[model samples]
Target: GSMNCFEMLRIDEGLRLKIYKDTEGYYTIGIGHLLTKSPSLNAAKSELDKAIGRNTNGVITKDEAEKLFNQDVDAAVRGILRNAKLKPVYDSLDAVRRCALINMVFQMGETGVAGFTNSLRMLQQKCWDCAAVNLAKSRWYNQTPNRAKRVITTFRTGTWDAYK
Candidate 1:
């Protein structure tokens, strides 16, 4: 089967029907929508209910989960696309590698990924191994070694190993 960044993200995030505190102790819901990212908790809850077609009280349906997930994913993808630093390499990469970068943006906001300036430069130069090593040097890798390993492998080999 074909691979999608969503497959990697769903596993990475783990769907949560009820709002809960994440590892960083922020209010997260759906497929990892941080309520702290919203203007206010009630503002986000209102959007959630709007998507579910009624008051959710606190939980969301799988369909609603997908909707929220899609929004987040789309936001990440668009962020990468518009990023001046990432745009060239992002457009040059194959689907597999592109998904890897998008997944990185999904995990860490686009600005977070932008901090990898040297790494992105290496990637733009097609230094796959160098790019991977540079990326692995980050706190992101230390924070989530398991996920980082797979994503770095995908970036290095331009493969869909992350689908595993």
Candidate 2:
């Protein structure tokens, strides 16, 4: 599926492939490859089953299950874009920077992105060096080195500048 900056940022090819394989190999395991592999109504149903199971005890009736699962999936999907705190900054970013921010939020959640309030503000101010330093100081940066490096590279190289 064609993704916006937010979707592309949060999920990488490897993770996307894993989601695809898991969804395909064990349709029961997750809503197998709904966005990646098939991107159909059936795949969305399957994906919801898995994500919802993470919260509910996986004991919902089939009819209720679909409704609840759909709600959760829709919320998660919207969460990627509609999160108020991040949306403004996200909307202002170039595509690559936006993708980096989205990936960070995807891995860390809204609260995680909130933790970077100062750093994001610095980036918004065009404090590239400071932004890089602030980004490295983040807890998310410490926890995810490789991902952080990728974003850092994007910040430094300007390769993703065209994404603006």
Candidate 3:
């Protein structure tokens, strides 16, 4: 099954590895210092905190955290859905395609994924061969080859099997 936003956010092995590496020296796992020690997780949490305008450990609460994170994720999703150049293509996408695109946008930011506008349009036309070709033609494809390939595969196949 495809991962929802929360599961994707939590169980992303690459991100987990990054967090582990970034936090290795400063703290131990399941410790009080986890928040301060992990640069990657700290950065993510800081963004959430800023969105809520608070310190956000005890004050914000777990449910509030999930809500804030979902709001941000939804905002990213809506931006892609509403974009004039990207919307028609996005609208044509199946749920898995949309989820993959949303994951890409969440990680890379809107501007980063915006550069794939043409590729997205091609995909919308059911030109998977052409869409795959276009996918390989972007600067994003060059910069993040593995991730770009994964996202393109999701778009082409309409499945999240590759992500697992």
- What clash count goes with each model? 0, 3, 0
Looking at model 1, residue 50 earns an lDDT score of 72
lDDT of 1 by residue, 59-122 (tens): 8777677777778767777777788887888878788788788777877777888889889878
Q: In model 1, where is the ten-residue run with the lowest total lDDT?
A: 35-44
lDDT of each: 0.78, 0.54, 0.61
Q: How does candidate 3 fare on TM-score? A: 0.62
Q: Give the residue spans of candidate 2 off by over 4 A.
A: 1-13, 16-77, 160-164
Which candidate gets the maximum TM-score versus the true structure? 1
Q: Candidate 3 has which clashing residue pairs, if any?
A: none
Report the C-alpha lDDT of model 2 over 1-164, residue by residue, as the tens digit: 44344333433423221222342444231222233344453554555546555434323443443444345445654785666667666666576666566555545577777777777777666677878877787666777777777777666554553233
lDDT of the structure predicted as candidate 3 = 0.61
Better of 1 and 2 by TM-score: 1
Backbone clashes in candidate 1 total 0
lDDT of 3 by residue, 73-130 (tens): 6777788767666567777878767777777776667777777777767777789878
Per lDDT, the best of the predicted structures is 1
Which wins on lDDT, candidate 1 or candidate 3?
1
| Residue 61 in model 2: lDDT | 44
User: Which residue window of length 10 is worst by lDDT in model 2?
Assistant: 27-36
| Candidate 1: RMSD to truth | 3.1
